[PDB]
Amino acid sequence: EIEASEVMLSTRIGSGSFGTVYKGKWHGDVAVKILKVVDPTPEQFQAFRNEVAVLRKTRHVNILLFMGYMTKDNLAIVTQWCEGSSLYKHLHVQETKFQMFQLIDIARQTAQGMDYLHAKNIIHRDMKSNNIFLHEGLTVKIGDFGLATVKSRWSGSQQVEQPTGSVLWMAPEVIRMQDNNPFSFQSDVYSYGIVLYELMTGELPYSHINNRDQIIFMVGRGYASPDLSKLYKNCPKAMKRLVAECVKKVKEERPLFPQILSSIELLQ
Amino acid sequence: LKDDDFEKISELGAGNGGVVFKVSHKPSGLVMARKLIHLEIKPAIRNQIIRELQVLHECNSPYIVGFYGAFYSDGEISICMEHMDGGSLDQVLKKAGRIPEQILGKVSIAVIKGLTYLREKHKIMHRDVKPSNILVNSRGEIKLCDFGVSGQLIDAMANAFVGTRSYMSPERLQGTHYSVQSDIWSMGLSLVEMAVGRYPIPPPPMAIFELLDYIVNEPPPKLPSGVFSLEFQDFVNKCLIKNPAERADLKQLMVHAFIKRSDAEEVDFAGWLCSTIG
Ligand SMILES: Nc1ncnc2c1ncn2[C@@H]1O[C@H](COP(=O)(O)OP(=O)(O)OP(O)(O)=S)[C@@H](O)[C@H]1O
Ligand SMILES: Nc1ncnc2c1ncn2[C@@H]1O[C@H](COP(=O)(O)OP(=O)(O)OP(O)(O)=S)[C@@H](O)[C@H]1O
Ligand SMILES: O=C(NOCCO)c1ccc2cncn2c1Nc1ccc(I)cc1F
Ligand SMILES: [Mg+2]
Ligand SMILES: [Mg+2]
């Protein structure tokens, strides 16, 4: 745990699915996310602390550092601060004009980071364009990975085991909740495929649906899928096959991240 | 209206879209509700949403909440509405086990009058008829809030985190053509959720998509018979019809015997609300 006296909370940045972001100055610039959990049960807190350990070990150029947690300023996590904005801001809010090779490079770096995260058996749930930051300009940084014990609420000693996070990137199998543990490598692969669609389209999927509920229902039932006619004409064909591969409804047919990385390495 | 001229007094509530704060207007000295909806959108979309929300100035009716202005401060769209002491009706379900039938009829009358005012004067459908989106006052007034004035605001909201419950009609979830009948279906669902002391999609927890499948392909929920009048069961059943064509439109709802009888009845809603919320 990190002692809160050394950390200093600067101006608020925003809020998300399971925490609120403050700018901190603990041994340099950091980001402190106070969790929405008010009374973390000892079991949840202990499993979260084990996470704190595992995520603190993780070290890739493509994932943000995870310094630790603090239980004094309510329940909080200290992570690496990223001056570069989020990928969602560049693609949609700022409408950043990325060249073809730049988009391919963002995809490659994201795939590399998720590959490492998956090699240590870390399922980066809540995978979306919000959690990807373009540090130094183009280096991709994955954040808010793991933390399954916190993102989901707890019914005492039992995790609620219900979906949480944005629905445009959520997998049909984790949308349906047909299994107690639907979060897996293939769910992260589908979420990466959704971010791939956003990279290759510049727009959020299911733009013809205005209500999130209709999105959830028609995604889980399969009536709605991200149509591939929105992709750029200059997008290479194998890139289109790769993204259609990643976004397939069937869980097991989606490729694992080494295969995707080989795909972009062929593309480049 | 600007951000610097409000002093947050308290929190009115927080939802998936945003959080509403009870604040004060320094230039005028009156207490108003300030809804902060956090979203990351283009500045052009921000201006478009603000201009579309300006239309709320001429939406004046006893059955819709007041509106003073709207503006974008920092990464959030802020809307300024008039303060309802009773909050919303979901607060009342958290207070009382179940809403009585007569006040439920008063609520139904208020919501249909608000819906028909909106449709006749503004050609605007609510789309969000929920227990959280109708508000009550200490004097007995019942108003509608969070209806679809700005289409671009709805489009920006579409990118939202997963929810816990839903009040959507099946025709919207299926993607078919929707009209006010969707709002009638939603308000019928709301009437069921008020009359019984629980969220009535899974009839006497279940995930969001399972809720949505269940309300798409299985029969609509119905009130527990024997503890409610036949008239209010007829009203909700006509409201809760899967087929939009068979579902009653507003014009039939005004002349619906439930609405006329509840209008004839005199119910001291202000006193009951004060008793149940303190
Ligand atoms: N390490 C960080 N460095 C800089 N900004 C950050 C960092 N972590 C979060 N933010 C910002 O904090 C705001 C809210 O982020 P979050 O709370 O993580 O929500 P989110 O990332 O959009 O989605 P989730 O599911 O809640 S993680 C956004 O504006 C992020 O850009
Ligand atoms: N004018 C008001 N007076 C009193 N309470 C209000 C007023 N406006 C909003 N509230 C409260 O603020 C809460 C937050 O509302 P929202 O942010 O719209 O979330 P919501 O109404 O629950 O719907 P969603 O789908 O969850 S965003 C409401 O549930 C009300 O209890
Ligand atoms: O607030 C909204 N939804 O919140 C609950 C879930 O819908 C909401 C939703 C859609 C919308 C389209 N144009 C404005 N919109 C909203 N804002 C709003 C509008 C008028 C009033 I009067 C009060 C308000 F809060
Ligand atoms: Mg994030
Ligand atoms: Mg609301």
What is the distance of C-alpha B268 from the center of its chain?
Answer: 22
Instruction: Verify that A64 and A195 share a domain, yes or no.
Output: no
Q: Which amino acid is at A86?
A: S
For A121-147, letters b (16+ CB in 10 Å) and e give: ebbbbbbbbbbbbbbeeeebbbbbbbb
CA-to-CA dists, residue B201 to A61, B179, B191, B235, angstroms = 47, 22, 12, 18
Residues paired with residue A19 on neighbouring β-strands, in sequence order? A35
What is the rounded CA–CA span in Å between residue B12 and residue A189? Answer: 40
Hey, what's the torsion of the CAs at A11, A15, A21, A22, to 10 degrees?
A: 20
Interface size, chain A vs chain B, as Cβ–Cβ contacts under 8 Å: 93
Ligand 3 within 6 A of CB of B235: no
Q: Which amino acid is at A22?
A: Y
**SS3 letters for chain B?**
CCHHHEEEEEEEEECCCEEEEEEEECCCCCEEEEEEEECCCCHHHHHHHHHHHHHHHHCCCCCECCEEEEEECCCEEEEEEECCCCEEHHHHHHHCCCCCHHHHHHHHHHHHHHHHHHHHHHCCCCCCCCHHHEEECCCCCEEECCCCCCHHHHHHHHCCECCCCCCCCHHHHHCCCCCHHHHHHHHHHHHHHHHCCCCCCCCCCCCHHHHHHHHHHCCCCCCCCCCCCHHHHHHHHHHCCCCCCCCCCHHHHHCCHHHHHHHHCCCCHHHHHHHHHC
**SS3 letters for A174-195?**
HHHCCCCCCCCHHHHHHHHHHH
Three-class SS state of A16: coil
Contact B258, B235 (CB under 8 A): yes
Judged by CB atoms within 8 Å, which residues 84-143 of A form the interface with B?
86, 88-89, 92-93, 95
Contact A17, A167 (CB under 8 A): no
Which of these is catalytic: A29, A126, A144, A227? A126
CA of B19 to the centre of ligand 2 (A): 7
Q: How many Cα atoms sit within 13 Å of B106 on the Cβ side?
A: 20
CA neighbor of A190 nearest in space, from A112, A88, A114: A114
Q: How many other CB atoms are found less than 10 A from the CB of residue B15? A: 16
- The answer on whether A193 is annotated among ligand-binding residues is no
> Kindly report the CA angle at A60 between A59 and A63, in degrees rounded to 5?
100
Could you please state the CATH topology (level 3) that the domain comprising B87-277 is classified under: Transferase(Phosphotransferase); domain 1 (1.10.510)
Judged by CB atoms within 8 Å, which residues 16-45 of A form the interface with B?
17
Q: Is residue A193 in some structural domain?
A: yes
Q: Which domain holds residue A167?
A: 87-267
Instruction: Verify that A68 and A158 share a domain, yes or no.
Output: no
Q: Is A126 a catalytic residue?
A: yes
The domain boundary residue, chosen from A55, A80, A105: A80
CB-CB: which of A88, A93, A177 is closest to B209? A177
What is the rounded CA–CA span in Å between residue A94 and residue B173? Answer: 31
Q: Is residue A152 in some structural domain?
A: yes
Three-class SS state of A237: helix
Ligand 3 within 6 A of CB of B183: no
Instruction: Verify that A101 and A47 share a domain, yes or no.
Output: no
Residue nearest to atom 29 of ligand 2 (CA): B132
Three-class SS state of A91: helix
Instruction: Verify that A184 and A114 share a domain, yes or no.
Output: yes
CA of B147 to the centre of ligand 3 (A): 5
Rg, Å, chain B Cα set: 19
Tokens for A121? 């058996």
Contact A198, A247 (CB under 8 A): no
Q: How many other CB atoms are found less than 10 A from the CB of residue B176? A: 11
Please, which residues have CB within 8 angstroms of residue A238's CB and are 6 or more apart in sequence?
A263, A266, A267
DSSP A103: H
Instruction: Verify that A159 and A256 share a domain, yes or no.
Output: yes
Beta strands in chain A (DSSP E): 9-15, 19-24, 30-35, 66-70, 76-80, 132-135, 139-142, 154-155, 158-159
Q: Which amino acid is at B214?
A: Y
Measured in angstroms, the CA of B8 and the nearest CA of chain A are apart by: 16
Q: Is residue A2 in some structural domain?
A: no
Contact A158, A44 (CB under 8 A): no
Q: Inter-chain contact B172–A213, Cβ cutoff 8 Å? A: yes
Chain A residue numbers touching B75 (CB-CB < 8 A)? 14
- The answer on whether A15 is annotated among ligand-binding residues is yes
Instruction: Verify that A263 and A214 share a domain, yes or no.
Output: yes
What is the rounded CA–CA span in Å between residue B257 and residue A86? Answer: 56
Contact A190, A125 (CB under 8 A): no
For B201-212, letters b (16+ CB in 10 Å) and e give: beeeeebbbbbb
Residues paired with residue A264 on neighbouring β-strands, in sequence order? none
Chain B residue numbers touching A220 (CB-CB < 8 A)? 209, 212-213
Measured in angstroms, the CA of A11 and the nearest CA of chain B are apart by: 12
Q: Is B123 exposed, middle or buried (0-12, 13-18, 19+ CB in 10 A)?
A: exposed
Q: How many structural domains comprise chain A?
A: 2
Q: At what angle do helices A257-267 and A100-119 cross, to 10 degrees?
A: 150
Q: Is residue A204 in some structural domain?
A: yes
**Residues near ligand 5 ion, CB 5 Å cutoff:** B 132-133, 146
Backbone φ and ψ of B199, nearest 5°: -80, 115
CB-CB: which of A160, A163, A204 is closest to B162? A163
Q: Inter-chain contact B173–A89, Cβ cutoff 8 Å? A: no
What is the rounded CA–CA span in Å between residue B242 and residue A133? Answer: 45
Measured in angstroms, the CA of B118 and the nearest CA of chain A are apart by: 20
Residue nearest to atom 4 of ligand 1 (CA): A82
- The answer on whether B38 is annotated among ligand-binding residues is no
What is the rounded CA–CA span in Å between residue B171 and residue B184? Answer: 12
Chain B residue numbers touching A217 (CB-CB < 8 A)? 173, 209, 212-213, 216
Q: Closest chain B residue to A219 measured between Cα atoms?
A: B209
Strand-strand pairing, A9-15 and A139-142? unpaired
Instruction: Verify that A56 and A180 share a domain, yes or no.
Output: no
Contact A205, A190 (CB under 8 A): no
Instruction: Verify that A123 and A212 share a domain, yes or no.
Output: yes
Cα four-point dihedral sign A199, A205, A210, A216: negative
Three-class SS state of A8: coil
Q: Would you say domain B3-82 falls under CATH 3.30.200.20? A: yes
Q: Which amino acid is at B266?
A: E
Q: Inter-chain contact A177–B207, Cβ cutoff 8 Å? A: yes
Please, which residues have CB within 8 angstroms of residue B170's CB and are 6 or more apart in sequence?
B185, B215, B216, B217, B242
Instruction: Verify that A162 and A226 share a domain, yes or no.
Output: yes
CA-to-CA dists, residue A166 to A127, A130, A194, B210, B242, angstroms = 9, 10, 12, 17, 28
Please, which residues have CB within 8 angstroms of residue A220's CB and are 6 or more apart in sequence?
A172, A175, A176, B209, B212, B213
Q: Is residue A24 in some structural domain?
A: yes
Substitution candidate for ligand 1 out of A22, A55, A139, A144 with most atoms within 8 A of CB? A144
Q: Inter-chain contact A89–B40, Cβ cutoff 8 Å? A: yes
Hey, what's the torsion of the CAs at A14, A20, A23, A29, to 10 degrees?
A: -120
The domain boundary residue, chosen from A45, A80, A115: A80
Instruction: Verify that A27 and A94 share a domain, yes or no.
Output: no
What is the rounded CA–CA span in Å between residue B18 and residue A105? Answer: 35
- The answer on whether B18 is annotated among ligand-binding residues is yes
Q: What is the resolution of this structure in A?
A: 3.3
Q: What is the CATH number of the domain that holds A49?
A: 3.30.200.20
Query: What are the extents of the domains in chain B?
Result: 3-82, 87-277
Experimental method: cryo-EM
CA neighbor of A69 nearest in space, from A45, A38, A43, A86: A45
What is the rounded CA–CA span in Å between residue A223 and residue A175? Answer: 13
Instruction: Verify that A195 and A100 share a domain, yes or no.
Output: yes
What is the rounded CA–CA span in Å between residue B158 and residue A70? Answer: 34
Residues paired with residue B81 on neighbouring β-strands, in sequence order? B33, B67
CA of A139 to the centre of ligand 4 (A): 16
Chain A residue numbers touching B213 (CB-CB < 8 A)? 217, 220-221
Backbone φ and ψ of B37, nearest 5°: -110, 110
Measured in angstroms, the CA of B163 and the nearest CA of chain A are apart by: 8
Instruction: Verify that A61 and A136 share a domain, yes or no.
Output: no
The domain boundary residue, chosen from A80, A108, A129: A80
